[PDB]
Amino acid sequence: AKREFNENRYLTERRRQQLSSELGLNEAQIKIWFQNKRAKIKKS
């Protein structure tokens, strides 16, 4: 059962399409936006 997970899919493509329309930004910003969220990772 335990082996691998959704390598950016479960919420990636799902939230990417919704985030675009929700935020009104282009996927081009999404790449950086998503990549930036994974880089820094929260604030704590």
User: Can you count the helices?
Assistant: 2
Report how far the terminal alpha carbons are from each other.
32 Å
The helix-and-strand class reads: mainly alpha
Number of domains: 1
Question: How would you describe the oligomerization state of the chains in this entry?
Answer: monomer
| Residue fraction in strands | under 5%
Molecular shape: globular
Integer-rounded radius of gyration? 12 Å
Q: What can be said about the biggest beta sheet?
A: none
Structure write-up:
Belongs to the engrailed homeobox family. It is found in: Nucleus. This is Segmentation polarity homeobox protein engrailed. The chain is 59% helix and 0% strand. With 44 residues, it is mostly helical. It has one domain. The radius of gyration is 12 Å and the shape is globular.
What is the compact description of this entry?
By secondary structure, the chain is an all-alpha fold.
Question: Which properties best describe this structure?
Answer:
59% helix; 44 residues; mainly alpha; monomer
Secondary-structure blueprint of this entry?
Layout: H1 12-23, H2 27-40
Function: This protein specifies the body segmentation pattern. It is required for the development of the central nervous system. Transcriptional regulator that represses activated promoters. Wg signaling operates by inactivating the SGG repression of EN autoactivation.
Protein name: Segmentation polarity homeobox protein engrailed
Family: Belongs to the engrailed homeobox family.
